[PDB]
Design an enzyme around this catalytic site. Structure first.
Site, PDB file in Angstrom:
ATOM      1  N   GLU A 207      16.980 -13.599  15.974  1.00 23.65           N
ATOM      2  CA  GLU A 207      17.638 -12.972  17.137  1.00 23.65           C
ATOM      3  C   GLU A 207      16.796 -11.776  17.596  1.00 23.65           C
ATOM      4  OE1 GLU A 207      21.893 -12.657  16.582  1.00 23.65           O
ATOM      5  OE2 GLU A 207      22.128 -11.494  18.527  1.00 23.65           O
TER       6      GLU A 207
ATOM      7  N   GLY B 102       0.826  -1.218   0.000  1.00 29.50           N
ATOM      8  CA  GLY B 102       0.000   0.000   0.000  1.00 29.50           C
ATOM      9  C   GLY B 102       0.852   1.256   0.000  1.00 29.50           C
TER      10      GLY B 102
ATOM     11  N   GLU C 174      -3.766   0.100  -6.316  1.00 31.56           N
ATOM     12  CA  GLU C 174      -3.851   1.119  -7.398  1.00 31.56           C
ATOM     13  C   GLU C 174      -2.434   1.456  -7.856  1.00 31.56           C
ATOM     14  OE1 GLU C 174      -3.339   5.301  -5.061  1.00 31.56           O
ATOM     15  OE2 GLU C 174      -3.396   4.890  -7.251  1.00 31.56           O
TER      16      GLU C 174
ATOM     17  N   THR D 281      -5.570  -1.474   1.905  1.00 26.73           N
ATOM     18  CA  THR D 281      -4.551  -2.376   1.348  1.00 26.73           C
ATOM     19  C   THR D 281      -3.548  -2.682   2.462  1.00 26.73           C
ATOM     20  OG1 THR D 281      -4.838  -1.571  -0.846  1.00 26.73           O
ATOM     21  CG2 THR D 281      -2.778  -2.688  -0.433  1.00 26.73           C
TER      22      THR D 281
ATOM     23  N   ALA E  77      -8.503  -0.294  -2.204  1.00 21.60           N
ATOM     24  CA  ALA E  77      -9.388  -0.928  -1.207  1.00 21.60           C
ATOM     25  C   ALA E  77     -10.242   0.130  -0.515  1.00 21.60           C
ATOM     26  CB  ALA E  77      -8.589  -1.740  -0.212  1.00 21.60           C
TER      27      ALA E  77
ATOM     28  N   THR F 121      -6.423   9.925   6.476  1.00 22.93           N
ATOM     29  CA  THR F 121      -7.306  10.129   5.293  1.00 22.93           C
ATOM     30  C   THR F 121      -8.632   9.397   5.483  1.00 22.93           C
ATOM     31  OG1 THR F 121      -5.780   8.491   4.330  1.00 22.93           O
ATOM     32  CG2 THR F 121      -5.643  10.770   3.540  1.00 22.93           C
TER      33      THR F 121
ATOM     34  N   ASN G 298       2.342   7.960  13.568  1.00 30.60           N
ATOM     35  CA  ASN G 298       2.510   9.151  12.706  1.00 30.60           C
ATOM     36  C   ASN G 298       2.458  10.422  13.572  1.00 30.60           C
ATOM     37  OD1 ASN G 298       3.292   8.327  10.173  1.00 30.60           O
ATOM     38  ND2 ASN G 298       1.209   8.408   9.303  1.00 30.60           N
TER      39      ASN G 298
ATOM     40  N   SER H  15       0.732   0.398   6.446  1.00 32.15           N
ATOM     41  CA  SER H  15      -0.106   1.176   7.381  1.00 32.15           C
ATOM     42  C   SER H  15      -1.132   0.235   8.008  1.00 32.15           C
ATOM     43  CB  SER H  15      -0.747   2.350   6.701  1.00 32.15           C
ATOM     44  OG  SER H  15      -1.735   1.962   5.753  1.00 32.15           O
TER      45      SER H  15
HETATM   46  N1  LIG Z   1       4.266   7.755   7.607  1.00 32.09           N
HETATM   47  C1  LIG Z   1       3.490   7.657   6.513  1.00 32.09           C
HETATM   48  N2  LIG Z   1       2.193   7.393   6.656  1.00 32.09           N
HETATM   49  C2  LIG Z   1       1.547   7.301   5.475  1.00 32.09           C
HETATM   50  C3  LIG Z   1       2.064   7.447   4.209  1.00 32.09           C
HETATM   51  N3  LIG Z   1       1.064   7.287   3.258  1.00 32.09           N
HETATM   52  C4  LIG Z   1      -0.011   7.035   3.959  1.00 32.09           C
HETATM   53  N4  LIG Z   1       0.211   7.048   5.311  1.00 32.09           N
HETATM   54  C5  LIG Z   1      -0.752   6.769   6.361  1.00 32.09           C
HETATM   55  O1  LIG Z   1      -1.342   5.519   6.075  1.00 32.09           O
HETATM   56  C6  LIG Z   1      -2.762   5.571   6.369  1.00 32.09           C
HETATM   57  C7  LIG Z   1      -3.524   5.424   5.081  1.00 32.09           C
HETATM   58  O2  LIG Z   1      -3.118   4.195   4.478  1.00 32.09           O
HETATM   59  P1  LIG Z   1      -2.512   4.129   3.012  1.00 32.09           P
HETATM   60  O3  LIG Z   1      -1.253   3.314   3.067  1.00 32.09           O
HETATM   61  O4  LIG Z   1      -2.560   5.456   2.346  1.00 32.09           O
HETATM   62  O5  LIG Z   1      -3.652   3.196   2.354  1.00 32.09           O
HETATM   63  P2  LIG Z   1      -3.410   1.955   1.379  1.00 32.09           P
HETATM   64  O6  LIG Z   1      -2.660   0.886   2.122  1.00 32.09           O
HETATM   65  O7  LIG Z   1      -2.837   2.498   0.129  1.00 32.09           O
HETATM   66  O8  LIG Z   1      -4.910   1.426   1.201  1.00 32.09           O
HETATM   67  P3  LIG Z   1      -6.080   1.914   0.165  1.00 32.09           P
HETATM   68  O9  LIG Z   1      -5.591   3.191  -0.469  1.00 32.09           O
HETATM   69  O10 LIG Z   1      -7.239   2.012   1.075  1.00 32.09           O
HETATM   70  O11 LIG Z   1      -6.181   0.795  -0.847  1.00 32.09           O
HETATM   71  C8  LIG Z   1      -2.975   6.898   7.101  1.00 32.09           C
HETATM   72  O12 LIG Z   1      -2.806   6.694   8.495  1.00 32.09           O
HETATM   73  C9  LIG Z   1      -1.892   7.774   6.465  1.00 32.09           C
HETATM   74  O13 LIG Z   1      -1.542   8.878   7.271  1.00 32.09           O
HETATM   75  C10 LIG Z   1       3.449   7.717   4.054  1.00 32.09           C
HETATM   76  O14 LIG Z   1       4.090   7.851   3.005  1.00 32.09           O
HETATM   77  N5  LIG Z   1       4.098   7.788   5.286  1.00 32.09           N
HETATM   78 MG   LIG Z   2      -3.763   3.455  -1.548  1.00 36.05          MG
END
Ligand SMILES: Nc1nc2c(ncn2[C@@H]2O[C@H](COP(=O)(O)OP(=O)(O)OP(=O)(O)O)[C@@H](O)[C@H]2O)c(=O)[nH]1
Ligand SMILES: [Mg+2]
Ligand SMILES: Nc1ncnc2c1ncn2[C@@H]1O[C@H](COP(=O)(O)OP(=O)(O)CP(=O)(O)O)[C@@H](O)[C@H]1O
Ligand SMILES: Nc1nc2c(ncn2[C@@H]2O[C@H](COP(=O)(O)OP(=O)(O)O)[C@@H](O)[C@H]2O)c(=O)[nH]1
Ligand SMILES: [Ca+2]
Ligand SMILES: [Ca+2]
Ligand SMILES: [Ca+2]
Ligand SMILES: [Cl-]
Ligand SMILES: [Mg+2]
Ligand SMILES: [Mg+2]
EC number: 3.6.5.-
Lengths: 342, 50, 439, 421
Positions: free
Chosen positions: C254, C10, C71, C145, C99, C179, C206, C140
């Site tokens: 370990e 993701g 995506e 995803t 997702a 988001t 975060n 995440s």
């Molecule tokens: N630290 C950090 N958090 C991120 C980043 N991108 C998204 N997030 C966090 O991840 C969460 C959203 O999940 P995403 O990873 O964007 O979602 P995905 O796994 O792509 O899932 P879908 O888009 O729903 O298919 C939120 O808590 C965001 O703040 C990133 O590059 N760094």
């Molecule tokens: Mg996504």
């Protein structure tokens, strides 16, 4: 508009702090489970400290220090004094105390109980928990079984004349978010209305100075003073007239030393100086004075009530130094501090 | 557990398409009722005049 | 030598993997084209860096890495970006529709259609390994995803590689950059399904990283680029023992032995110091004592919580730069007399210490100043359960009204899975209380 | 998630639809011949969401224009951007629908609907990955209302896994064409409750009051009303059309905004209101003000289930975060405590002839006031069966009106249930 929640309906001190905040017009009470508060007036048990300081754009303050229970439960206080280098086993202002379960300190308590028998020393003790007085070990231990502490009972208390009567001193102490220690200038003596009787511990009304016990069992409730409550101006007059000293010199130096020693001992463990939320707490310290005018700590209360006539002033004190210091709007305390070089 | 999920999705979908099928049946009955009432009006005017 | 495969799932998993592999290339002297002039064995070898990099006959060093997203837009930036030549196209896997912040859509609906392809691409990396240790999984908790696909993948990896260690790097949700309103649902569902399949999981809140970027790097409004460069430093600290010569945390097994005595309590707290602004024109360099003392400050933790009010089961200190054991041992003695460090009764009160003499690498033009020494502390403390308590409370508020539950049921998930996942978290909160609190 | 198919039905639907395409064509640097003459790569990055690419780098709206009379679509074809639409995507009959839901839904509309679906299928078939559909229409007339909701039911049958979004113009006695508007609106709401995922409630009552009270227009025209609608529509589609993190596709917006399937009726808002320089505090206070809402509902009479806020222009993201936190912290009682963090904020760098603007989308329990108002106007006529003969003449029974009234009263009760919880 600063916001606050109220999670303890039974606190008289914080019901009054709540009323004072509302009357400034700059504070709005939210529903108890709304997370968007500046100030939590928290519950006594299982306060969710783990959910504080995770609200972006809100500085959050709670009226309890997490970990202060180490001071404010009988068993914990005894353990903290013995095991902290800065208080030590040889601490001179805490009565000889042992923790006893129905880990344990039975066989260490019996060993010291024999040294008094052996040397013909006064051998009366008190069992209590979060109450019985006896000079016989096996009657205290039988009662417990039927978590407690056995504490040397102070056989030579100071006695107020007229009435030949025992008392304890309540001091109120406020610790702010910066860990300034403020002693409220008004204390109270909770007096006995019965003369003291060293040959009859079975009768507990002349031995136990609590406001509830004297109000029910004692047949002299209010004879000497309103409630069983002598305030500092009168007690100071008494010490000048009768014993040729002051409250400041004879007692308050020792009280301030003890408050500062207890709270400086737990500061690394409870301080919120570098934390994502901040704490203050009002403590009630309970002292005995012996006939040599030596002061003994009995206990620390984490959720004290106040004397009726001091509610107004103390509660205004709490908004002034604890709350408005963090949330300013548009002294009744002595600041306890000492920086001696050695 | 993945096939069980997929079968619950297929079930909810078949339920929806049955409900949308009852809607098309109702739509067909409204327009046939409209035709039958226009025809019955014309018929009954024709007979009353004769 | 024993290979590790990294799996980035993701958006969060993929963007953090981009930052980590950029940093690994700089640490090992690997150019964006994959060439590594300092590597004298052309086309193969069993050096420590070969745990993370395979080698072609042409001298190309290729990350042992799979990137998966449902995506294409995030992985398309890897495909056309600075490190595009590093990765063979079959390592970069994308679907057409995501997702939609829905665990059930990631796990059941879209997971079922892409899972066999992802396992096939992983099998291709595994087949080039002589002694595969296992997997590092970046995702995440909050995304559909990151939450739903990852938990399906972790279940399938337990089946297909039953003897392999699985380590997670998990982004815990913060409302300042989140988001989706449903992130607490997704977090509890994935934690429930993954918990038996993960040996050791490093959670990054975060909120903690955001505040470290604001407070210590003077970034007014941190972006993912800011957060990810800091996260990649901490990940690099943790994985350095696998990529360089040394005698501590040298294999994935370990990590479990040193940090996780109880299998369910497998969430170590990471604390990192020092974090210093590159824009800061005058900086006094911090001693071993100062950076070690900073490991006991909540403000430097990857999760905000208070270790003074829990118990330690394990503590590792991972130093990089100009550090000798004498200064570490003096630092620890001073800290013991001043801080509330309470271990559980059944564990020794002690620190495992690793020192790598190479100072921390920074990404040129980044926000972090170059420092002479740094440390990452990994401690297994009961205090991290505060973060579960926060998530469980938000879950309970919404679930009591069944808010948004119809989106999950509509993907073929049963309502029962919510209350089962939540009961597993109640039992987890209770496990932490039993180990942590006295009576 | 990528392509959206846009449908505009009837007079209102086609007039507000044409303004939508004029406004967003200008934002994306597309001229009336479909040529790109813009200055930024941000304009083209997500152009495919709304535009097809044709021969010679021409951009063609993924737009289908529907009416039961030709008049309003002849005016579109002559209007400024009229030549940009695909000619085969104009689907019109000759009969009209006489402001009658039954004609749109059951008789005249039924005759035309299959040829509209032929065009929807042609647009859908060449989509890499269709996200779903947006329909512009009024609920008070016959074609937009009756044929629009027929189309929605047929589109759902053929694409049951795709998202359905409407911009639905709710009628008002203050801006009224016929007495039967409340009948047409009640019958339409019954369809929308079951067959859309997200409905933007555009209240002609609110647009009139904004034009009169705020913009000081003594005599508001449909043109004045549609200026507010097109600015709102540009605002609420910013996150679909420009690179961004939050609500970037129709399914993610629905998952953030709809906690219960039937409560999907949104109160849009816009700041500043326009017929020179606005601060972030001022944008934030104005976008949440009752007077800036496009539905005539007092948000202080209910609670926010969910909110999306979109800020447009070059501004401090730190100041946007601080102000958005300030509104929630100061007015905490109006945000339900059982959906934590229920306010999401997006910032896009491209402003709409303004330096900065804010668009508000709220799922408020106060929207019940709009449904109660329509319900009261429906009942006042329906208790005497007044004007029913227009509907029974097209084959409808009274019972169908009783069912629509009950379902709309049930929707009101459901908003009230979550307001008290
Ligand atoms: N630290 C950090 N958090 C991120 C980043 N991108 C998204 N997030 C966090 O991840 C969460 C959203 O999940 P995403 O990873 O964007 O979602 P995905 O796994 O792509 O899932 P879908 O888009 O729903 O298919 C939120 O808590 C965001 O703040 C990133 O590059 N760094
Ligand atoms: Mg996504
Ligand atoms: N070691 C001791 N020697 C003499 N008297 C003692 C004593 N310990 C307790 N007392 C008596 O008991 C009283 C306090 O009992 P204790 O403090 O254990 O109960 P408690 O916790 O209910 C009082 P509070 O309401 O202040 O919390 C004192 O006022 C004193 O009269
Ligand atoms: N805001 C707005 N409302 C309109 C417009 N045209 C008509 N209306 C309203 O739409 C309703 C009439 O429906 P209309 O679209 O004309 O009928 P149709 O062609 O049968 O769908 C009434 O509520 C009018 O107040 C317009 O251009 N803008
Ligand atoms: Ca080699
Ligand atoms: Ca396993
Ligand atoms: Ca015909
Ligand atoms: Cl295996
Ligand atoms: Mg007590
Ligand atoms: Mg009209």
């Amino acid at each position: 508009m600063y916001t606050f929640v109220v999670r303890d309906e039974n606190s008289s001190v914080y019901a009054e702090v709540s009323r004072l905040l509302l009357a400034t017009g700059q504070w709005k009470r939210l529903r108890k489970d709304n997370p968007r508060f500046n100030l939590m007036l928290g519950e006594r048990n299982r306060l969710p400290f783990g959910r504080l300081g995770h609200e972006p754009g809100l500085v959050q303050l709670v009226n309890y220090y997490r970990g202060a229970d180490k001071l404010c439960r009988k068993a914990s206080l005894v353990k903290l004094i013995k095991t902290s280098p800065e208080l030590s086993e040889s601490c001179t202002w805490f009565p000889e105390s042992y923790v006893i379960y129905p880990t344990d300190e039975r066989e260490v308590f019996l060993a010291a109980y024999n040294r008094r028998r052996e040397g013909r020393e006064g051998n009366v003790w008190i069992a209590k928990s979060s109450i019985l007085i006896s000079s016989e070990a096996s009657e205290l231990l039988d009662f417990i079984d039927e978590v407690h502490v056995i504490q040397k009972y102070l056989e030579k208390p100071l006695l107020l004349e007229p009435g030949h009567r025992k008392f304890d001193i309540r001091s109120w102490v406020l610790v702010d978010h910066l860990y300034n220690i403020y002693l409220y200038r008004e204390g109270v003596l909770r007096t006995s209305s019965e003369p003291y009787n060293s040959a009859n511990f079975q009768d507990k009304t002349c031995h136990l100075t609590n406001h509830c016990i004297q109000k029910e069992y004692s047949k002299n409730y209010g004879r000497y003073e309103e409630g069983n409550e002598m305030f500092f101006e009168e007690f100071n007059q008494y010490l000048m007239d009768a014993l040729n000293t002051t409250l400041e010199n004879s007692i308050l130096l020792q009280i301030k030393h003890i408050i500062r020693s207890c709270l400086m001992c737990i500061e690394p463990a409870i301080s919120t100086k570098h934390l994502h939320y901040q704490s203050f707490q009002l403590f009630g310290f309970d002292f005995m004075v012996d006939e040599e005018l030596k002061v003994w700590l009995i206990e620390v209360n984490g959720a004290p009530a106040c004397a009726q006539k001091l509610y107004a002033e103390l509660c205004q004190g709490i908004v002034d130094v604890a709350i408005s210091s963090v949330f300013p709007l548009a002294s009744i305390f002595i600041k306890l501090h000492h920086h001696h070089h050695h | 557990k993945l096939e069980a999920a997929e079968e619950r999705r297929k079930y909810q979908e078949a339920e929806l398409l049955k409900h949308l099928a009852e809607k098309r049946e109702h739509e067909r009955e409204v327009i046939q009722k409209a035709i039958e009432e226009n025809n019955n009006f014309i018929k009954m005017a024709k007979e009353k005049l004769a | 030598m024993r290979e590790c495969i990294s799996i980035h799932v993701g958006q969060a998993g993929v963007q953090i993997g981009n930052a980590c592999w950029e940093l690994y290339c700089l640490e090992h002297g690997i150019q964006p084209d994959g060439q590594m002039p300092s590597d004298k064995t052309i086309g193969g070898g069993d050096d420590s860096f070969n745990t993370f990099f395979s080698e072609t006959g042409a001298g190309k060093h290729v990350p042992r890495a799979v990137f998966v997203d449902l995506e294409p837009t995030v992985i398309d930036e890897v495909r056309t970006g600075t490190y595009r030549q590093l990765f063979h196209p079959e390592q970069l896997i994308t679907g057409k529709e995501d997702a939609a912040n829905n665990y059930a859509r990631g796990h059941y609906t879209i997971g079922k259609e892409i899972i066999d392809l992802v396992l096939d691409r992983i099998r291709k990396l595994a087949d080039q390994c002589t002694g595969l240790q296992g997997f590092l999984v970046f995702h995440s908790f909050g995304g559909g995803t990151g939450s739903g696909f990852t938990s399906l993948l972790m279940e399938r990896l337990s089946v297909d590689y039953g003897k392999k260690s699985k380590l997670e790097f998990s982004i815990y949700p913060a409302p300042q950059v989140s988001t989706a309103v449903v992130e607490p649902y997704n977090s509890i569902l994935t934690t429930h399904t993954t918990l038996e399949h993960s040996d050791c999981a490093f959670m990054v809140d975060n909120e903690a990283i955001y505040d470290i970027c604001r407070r210590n790097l003077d970034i007014e409004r941190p972006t993912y680029t800011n957060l990810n460069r800091l996260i990649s430093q901490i990940v690099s600290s943790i994985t350095a023992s696998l990529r360089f010569d040394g005698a501590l945390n040298v294999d994935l097994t370990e990590f479990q032995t040193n940090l996780v005595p109880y299998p369910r309590i497998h969430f170590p707290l990471a604390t990192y110091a020092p974090v210093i602004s590159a824009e800061k024109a005058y900086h006094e360099q911090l001693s071993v004592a100062e950076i070690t003392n900073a490991c006991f400050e909540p403000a430097n933790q990857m999760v905000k919580c208070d270790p003074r009010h829990g118990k330690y089961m394990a503590c590792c200190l991972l130093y990089r730069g100009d550090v000798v054991p004498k200064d570490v041992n003096a630092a620890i003695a001073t800290i013991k007399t001043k801080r509330s460090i309470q271990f559980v009764d059944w564990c020794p009160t002690g620190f495992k210490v690793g020192i790598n003499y190479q100072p921390p690498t920074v990404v040129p033009g980044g926000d972090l100043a170059k420092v002479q020494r740094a440390v990452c502390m990994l401690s297994n403390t009961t205090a991290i359960a505060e973060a579960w308590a926060r998530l469980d409370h938000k879950f309970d508020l919404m679930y009591a009204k069944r808010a948004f539950v119809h989106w999950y049921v509509g993907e073929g998930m049963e309502e029962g899975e919510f209350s089962e996942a939540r009961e597993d978290m109640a039992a987890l909160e209770k496990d932490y209380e039993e180990v942590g609190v006295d009576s | 998630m990528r392509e959206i198919v846009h449908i505009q039905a009837g007079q209102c639907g086609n007039q507000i639809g044409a303004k939508f395409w004029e406004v967003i064509s200008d934002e994306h640097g597309i001229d009336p011949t479909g040529s790109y003459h813009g200055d930024s790569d941000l304009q083209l990055e997500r152009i495919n969401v709304y535009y097809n690419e044709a021969a010679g780098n021409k951009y063609v709206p993924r737009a289908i224009l529907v009416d039961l009379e030709p008049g309003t679509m002849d005016s579109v074809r002559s209007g400024p951007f009229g030549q940009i639409f695909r000619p085969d995507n104009f689907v019109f009959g000759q009969s009209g629908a006489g402001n009658n839901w039954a004609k749109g839904h059951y008789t005249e509309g039924a005759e035309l609907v299959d040829s509209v679906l032929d065009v929807v299928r042609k647009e859908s078939e060449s989509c890499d990955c269709l996200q779903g559909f947006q329909l512009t229409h009024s609920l008070g007339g016959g074609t937009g209302s009756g044929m629009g909701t027929l189309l929605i039911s047929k589109i759902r049958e053929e694409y049951p896994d795709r998202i359905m979004n409407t911009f639905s113009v709710v009628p008002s006695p203050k801006v009224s064409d016929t007495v039967v508007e409340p009948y047409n609106a009640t019958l339409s709401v019954h369809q929308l409750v079951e067959n859309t995922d997200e409905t933007y409630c555009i209240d002609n009552e609110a647009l009139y009051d904004i034009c009169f009270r705020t913009l000081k227009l003594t005599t508001p025209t449909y043109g004045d009303l549609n200026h507010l609608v097109s600015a709102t529509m540009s605002g609420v589609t910013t996150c679909l059309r420009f690179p961004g993190q939050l609500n970037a596709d129709l399914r993610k917006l629905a998952v953030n905004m709809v906690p219960f399937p039937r409560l999907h009726f949104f109160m849009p808002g816009f700041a500043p209101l326009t017929s020179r320089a606005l601060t972030v505090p001022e944008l934030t206070q104005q976008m949440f003000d009752a007077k800036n809402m496009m539905a005539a509902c007092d948000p202080r009479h209910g609670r926010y289930l969910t909110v999306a806020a979109v800020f447009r222009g070059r501004m401090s993201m730190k100041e946007v975060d601080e102000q958005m936190l300030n509104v929630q912290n100061k007015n905490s009682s109006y945000f339900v405590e059982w959906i934590p963090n229920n306010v999401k904020t997006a910032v896009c760098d491209i402003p709409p002839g303004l330096k900065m603007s804010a668009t508000f989308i709220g799922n408020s329990t106060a929207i019940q006031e709009l449904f109660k108002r329509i319900s009261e106007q429906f009942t006042a006529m329906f208790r005497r069966k007044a004007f029913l003969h227009w509907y029974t003449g097209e084959g409808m029974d009274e019972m169908e009106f009783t069912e629509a009234e009950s379902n709309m009263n049930d929707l009101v009760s459901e908003y009230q249930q979550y307001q008290d919880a």
